[PDB]
């Protein structure tokens, strides 16, 4: 649950804790993130509010 | 090494054994963890209530950030469902997130069976016939559920 990321289930570090990439609050791993928005089939977006990546 | 893809799916896997799965069943086939069986109730707002549908899904090696394969087993007469089983669900494509779990696509096939859309048909002939001819649409589903699904 908690000091979990929801999509690969890795232990939160302290650096991706402290990690907001979208303003609705929902935290991935640093990881996760640069997969989404890198990936060509990839939309690049937050998996909650699909507000694009800045 | 370790797949992040074969992670997530034992994560939810956990999550649908401590909570209870009221009007649905779901669970890997065999050892394989991307080839599941799931199982649905038709709902009782819908003309499938009182026929249990089987479906096959396969996860992808790149889950969750791609929709898992899911079709549909038991012959089903839905205007977004076509005779090999596969569903026009928009969550399923184009509108996919790393965060829909197998428990919401599940329930959203549900809450698709209770509301097609007919505006963005898989079978057009259905379709037409939902539009058009509400009550014939309605009593064929029926016979297709006490025949196939029950
Ligand atoms: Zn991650
Ligand atoms: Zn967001």
Known sequence: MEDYCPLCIEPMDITDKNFFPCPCGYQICQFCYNNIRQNPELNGRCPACRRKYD | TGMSSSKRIAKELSDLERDPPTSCSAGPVGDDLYHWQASIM??????????????????????????????????????????????????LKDQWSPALTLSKVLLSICSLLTDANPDDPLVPEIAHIYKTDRPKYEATAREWTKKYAV
């Open chain 2, 42 to 91: 038709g709902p009782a707002d819908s003309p499938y209530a009182g026929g249990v549908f089987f479906l096959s899904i396969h996860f992808p090696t790149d889950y969750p950030f791609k929709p898992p394969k899911i079709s549909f087993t038991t012959k089903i007469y839905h205007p977004n469902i076509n005779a090999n089983g596969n569903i026009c669900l928009d969550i």
